[PDB]
């Protein structure tokens with residue numbers, strides 16, 4: 001479970017600040033509402049897929065969890081890699097997702113809770 005500023009710093013080190021034009025506060029806001037900053041978060045979807053990790057990346061498209069029929073593994077990783085204390089796999093897969101044409105609208109919590117808001121508040125006070 002990251003602190004806000006700790007996660008901001010880790011995301012910046014791993015290349016998310018202004019990635020595909022999304023400022024760091026967007027990514028921190030998305031992680032807050034997707035996972036509560038918890039790398040171990042998992043949530044099953046209605047359709048049988050599961051969302052994994054700090055950015056709740058979905059097994060329907062992005063990772064293999066062994067139990068999501070007809071799904072793809074576009075990030076080429078086990079979904080468990082998205083639960084690690086090390087956010088590298090989540091960041092690298094999120095870079096692919098955000099590049100795929102719909103930007104951060106892929107993250108429902110971002111669209112509904114971060115988009116259009118003062119996202120820079122999420123990085124206030126942080127040494128990065």
Ligand SMILES: [Cl-]
Pocket residue numbers: 003006
């Ligand atoms: Cl802290």
Ligand SMILES: [Cl-]
Pocket residue numbers: 023024025026119120121123
């Ligand atoms: Cl920001």
Ligand SMILES: [Cl-]
Pocket residue numbers: 108109112113
């Ligand atoms: Cl939402």
Ligand SMILES: [Cl-]
Pocket residue numbers: none
């Ligand atoms: Cl500190």
Ligand code: NA
Pocket residue numbers: 059060061062063064065068071072073
């Ligand atoms: Na999959």
